[PDB]
């Protein structure tokens, strides 16, 4: 537990987890269920909010920039895998914009 | 009267942007994408909001941003355009990821309270 990590749990994750666009990112991408047979050929580090939330709850992270990187990876995976015109890209952009807004007011010192 | 000068914006300019700019992978990002000179006739059909570190640097220098998050959004847009336009296997994608990680590392150390 640091001040920065607690801000990411209570302020950042809280904001994002309950968002109306959050639902495709709450659990790991299931390639079989989603019909995406190349997903893991293209994405080598899958990431999702459920994993991140769990990690925060279980005190997995030693620094806030670590947790921050998990959020970025999740969003980046989405942009790299999907087609430019897909709704999901649009949903990821919206969520990423809230992420950065909250992260701007995050405590400076670990 | 677009924006002002804050502590966070001074930090994004002198500490975050400076590091990224001088990075060995930064060269494709220092100026707007010239789709003609590069032979990418579909760029502007796919990327609706072009952004580059040259534009962000100028905006910082002319007090265009009102708050830090506005400048952060511009950084995010630059990185996202790259991921969205380019093929997953392209070198450019790897370069952007590297820069994006540094950006996040340095944003984590930005002053918490925005003061004019
Ligand atoms: C994160 C991501 O790329 C997802 C996430 C979904 C998704 C779609 C429905 C239910 C849960 N997740 C999806 C569908 C098609 C293509 C890509 N994705
Ligand atoms: C930011 C971006 O997407 C760039 C930027 C370049 C680039 C290529 C050569 C010189 C300057 N910039 C490029 C080339 C091919 C595909 C994509 N890009």
From Swiss-Prot, chain B:
A protein binds at residues 42, 85-87, 90-91. Changing residue 86 to A: Abolished binding to histone H4 acetylated at 'Lys-12' (H4K12ac). Abolished binding to histone H4 acetyl-methylated. Disulfide bonds: none annotated. Changing residue 90 to A: Abolished binding to histone H4 acetylated at 'Lys-12' (H4K12ac). It is found in: Nucleus; Chromosome. Residues 4-110 form the Bromo domain. Changing residue 43 to A: Abolished binding to histone H4 acetylated at 'Lys-12' (H4K12ac). The first bromo domain specifically recognizes histone H4 acetylated at 'Lys-12' (H4K12ac). It also specifically binds histone H4 acetyl-methylated at 'Lys-5' and 'Lys-12' (H4K5acme and H4K12acme, respectively). The second bromo domain recognizes and binds histone H4 acetylated at 'Lys-5' and 'Lys-12' (H4K5ac and H4K12ac, respectively). Chromatin reader protein that specifically recognizes and binds histone H4 acetylated at 'Lys-5' and 'Lys-12' (H4K5ac and H4K12ac, respectively), thereby controlling gene expression and remodeling chromatin structures. Recruits transcription factors and coactivators to target gene sites, and activates RNA polymerase II machinery for transcriptional elongation. Some specific inhibitors of BRD2 that prevent binding to acetylated histone are promising therapeutic molecules for the treatment of cancers or inflammatory diseases. ABBV-744, a small molecule, has been tested on tumors with success: ABBV-744 antiproliferative activity is mainly restricted to cell lines of acute myeloid leukaemia and prostate cancer and is able to displace BRD4 from chromatin. GSK046 (iBET-BD2), which specifically inhibits the second bromo domain, is a promising therapeutic small molecule for the treatment of inflammatory and autoimmune diseases. Belongs to the BET family. Homodimer. Interacts with E2F1. Interacts with (acetylated) STAT3; promoting STAT3 recruitment to chromatin. Interacts with CTCF; promoting BRD2 recruitment to chromatin. This is Bromodomain-containing protein 2. It comes from Homo sapiens. The chain holds residues 72 to 186 of 801 of the full protein.
């Amino acid at each position: 537990v640091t001040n920065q990590l607690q801000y990411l749990h209570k302020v950042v994750m809280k904001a994002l987890w309950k968002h109306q666009f959050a639902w495709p990112f709450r659990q790991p991408v299931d390639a079989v269920k989603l019909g995406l047979p190349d997903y893991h050929k293209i994405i080598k580090q899958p990431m999702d909010m459920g994993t991140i939330k769990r990690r925060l709850e279980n005190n997995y992270y030693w620094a806030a920039s670590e947790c921050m990187q998990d959020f970025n990876t999740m969003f980046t995976n989405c942009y790299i895998y999907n087609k430019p015109t897909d709704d999901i890209v649009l949903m990821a952009q919206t969520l990423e914009k809230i992420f950065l807004q909250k992260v701007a007011s995050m405590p400076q010192e670990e």
